[PDB]
Swiss-Prot record, chains A, C:
Cleaves the C-terminus of replicase polyprotein at 11 sites. Recognizes substrates containing the core sequence [ILMVF]-Q-|-[SGACN]. Cleaves and inactivates human TRMT1, preventing tRNA guanine(26)-dimethylation of tRNAs. May cleave human NLRP1 in lung epithelial cells, thereby activating the NLRP1 inflammasome pathway. May cleave human GSDMD, triggering alternative GSDME-mediated epithelial cell death upon activation of the NLRP1 inflammasome, which may enhance the release interleukins 1B, 6, 16 and 18. Also able to bind an ADP-ribose-1''-phosphate (ADRP). It catalyses: TSAVLQ-|-SGFRK-NH2 and SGVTFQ-|-GKFKK the two peptides corresponding to the two self-cleavage sites of the SARS 3C-like proteinase are the two most reactive peptide substrates. The enzyme exhibits a strong preference for substrates containing Gln at P1 position and Leu at P2 position. The lineage of its organism: Viruses, Riboviria, Orthornavirae, Pisuviricota, Pisoniviricetes. Inhibited by pyridone-containing alpha-ketoamides compounds 13a and 13b. In turn, alpha-ketoamide 13b (tert-butyl (1-((S)-1-(((S)-4-(benzylamino)-3,4-dioxo-1-((S)-2-oxopyrrolidin-3-yl)butan-2-yl)amino)-3-cyclopropyl-1-oxopropan-2-yl)-2-oxo-1,2-dihydropyridin-3-yl)carbamate) inhibits SARS-CoV-2 replication in human lung cells. Inhibited ex vivo by michael acceptor inhibitor N3. Inhibited ex vivo by compound 11a and 11b. This is 3C-like proteinase nsp5. 3CL-PRO exists as monomer and homodimer. Only the homodimer shows catalytic activity. Interacts with host FBXO22; this interaction promotes the proteasomal degradation of nsp5. Changing residue 90 to R: In strain: Beta/B.1.351. There is a cross-link at residues 5, 90 (Glycyl lysine isopeptide (Lys-Gly) (interchain with G-Cter in ubiquitin)). Changing residue 205 to V: In strain: Zeta/P.2.
Length: 306, 6, 306, 6
């Protein structure tokens, strides 16, 4: 019993984190085989971040301008290139701790673990979600760029996020591991509009199923709604639309609890319209939306990794 | 409002 | 910016987790140097857990009754003993991944990271606190006993909790790494009274300081209270007393924000008496008490480890 | 109410 914001074990990623220094800029890199991946703004200077021309900045660099530190050993950079908004620094040593891995570009609503790092050294691990507006509500200070987000499946680390920057609202923006930003953002220190965020409906439903599995049932009721009727309520409360694919993804949790998806939707409608009346669900007074259906199954069934 | 590189 | 429930990186602990099987019982052990530590109820049988006599049960076992699996290699048990409620299984191989470590018995209100494990394999990592009633609000299924809680300082892992069992309210009980239970609990499958829990006042204050550091200031006010007057309010709302030592521990956060501790106490009193009026603090509609003052400094300053 | 070993 119990339900916690649960991250993946971070050891496989810890062994990949290095420090990258260029000029007076320090951030983190991800060392896989003989390549170090890091945010390209490491090559910027202090007075040229309103609109840096990264092609020019990189042409002006050499291999020796990139200092790469892996724990207590310095790695020799033997090549450098740009792919979208990341740099690929080829080094003369393959990382002996390289896990089985993949690069994945996630959809909004999907969650991942973040290993926050400074000076190439891990600081802590936490869970977050790709928001519908393609920001993440992280915990990041100056020097944390190059920290990565990931999921694990058995022995394979699926990297999905590399951290770049912080928006003026205090939320965070970054790229996939090919260097493509999530959302409309660009690596310029400019005013950039973030979309109005919404609540991840399918995740809220997943978490209500987790609550039922853990014995919180006070919000259940005898009613069922239609998908169309529920989506009318969702739109009024700034919730994402629920699709039939979402209903199918919630299949396993519906079968385990015996509560049909549209039955749980009637609970969610009542919670949106009437609030919680001083009660809590899994220790929360708000409706939680950063657990996916898979996250719930993972944690309530004890899935382990390699 | 300004984006801040980290 | 941002403030998350942040666990320590788990890699150093992952390399210590093994599987221990005795009879038909499987749980986890902690492999440090040439000793594996695990909960002693691994030697129980299904019909003898109301009041097992552990001295008898252990006299009836031999080394070969303990199967210890470290990843893909089985470790040979060459000795066994009991210390309080843990077993120490001496093995013929020292763990080559043994980190610098200590065993610590923590005070109520202190936090730690849990590496939840099944079959000797890590499942996930989350943060929790030793409650004032010496339970922890964990996330644990059958087979998770032997999972450990820990803190890290630089390169040294301080182990503070080993998981044993779940109380009927769904909260969790366990021991220090010398096998001494936290709280009044005993390893018997019996009805056992847990004390009425209370809220960790100094931690709530720490988290209000984290909120201020992150720009949430709506709950601040111009008032200051006395320690005695605040403690009268704390007692009415089932909060722990605030001591002068707590006030001193909050020193660094008070100095950084310029908000005297007794000034922040006046905010907390107002929040207790009037609620939040539909607002949130660091994404929460409840007053959060599982961040210590050190946790706040750690996360808002970017402390890293080895 | 009963404690459950895990």
């Amino acid at each position: 019993s119990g339900f916690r914001k649960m991250a993946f074990p971070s050891g496989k990623v810890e062994g990949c984190m290095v420090q990258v220094i260029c000029g007076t800029t320090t951030l983190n890199g991800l060392w896989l085989d003989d390549v170090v991946y890091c945010p390209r703004h490491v090559i910027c200077t202090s007075e040229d971040m309103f609109n840096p021309n990264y092609e020019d900045l990189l042409i002006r660099k050499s291999n020796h301008n990139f200092l790469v530190q892996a724990g207590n050993v310095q790695l020799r950079v033997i090549g450098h290139s740009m792919q979208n908004c990341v740099l690929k620094l080829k080094v003369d040593t393959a990382n002996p701790k390289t896990p089985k891995y993949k690069f994945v570009r996630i959809q909004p609503g999907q969650t991942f673990s973040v290993l926050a790092c400074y000076n190439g050294s891990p600081s802590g691990v936490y869970q977050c979600a790709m928001r519908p507006n393609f920001t993440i509500k992280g915990s990041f200070l100056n020097g944390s760029a190059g920290s990565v987000g990931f999921n694990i499946d058995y022995d394979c680390v699926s990297f999905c996020y590399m951290h770049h920057m912080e928006l003026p609202t205090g939320v965070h923006a970054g790229t996939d591991l090919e260097g493509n930003f999530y959302g409309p953002f660009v690596d310029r220190q400019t005013a950039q509009a973030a979309g109005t965020d919404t609540t991840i409906t399918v995740n809220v439903l997943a978490w209500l199923y987790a609550a039922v599995i853990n014995g919180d049932r006070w919000f259940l009721n005898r009613f069922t709604t239609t998908l169309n009727d529920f989506n009318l309520v969702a739109m009024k409360y700034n919730y994402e639309p629920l699709t039939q694919d979402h209903v199918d993804i919630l299949g396993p949790l519906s079968a385990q609890t015996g509560i049909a998806v549209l039955d749980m939707c009637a609970s969610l409608k009542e919670l949106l319209q009437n609030g919680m009346n001083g009660r809590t669900i899994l220790g929360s007074a708000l409706l939680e939306d950063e657990f996916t259906p898979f996250d719930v199954v993972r944690q309530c069934s004890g899935v382990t990794f390699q | 409002s300004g984006v801040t590189f980290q």
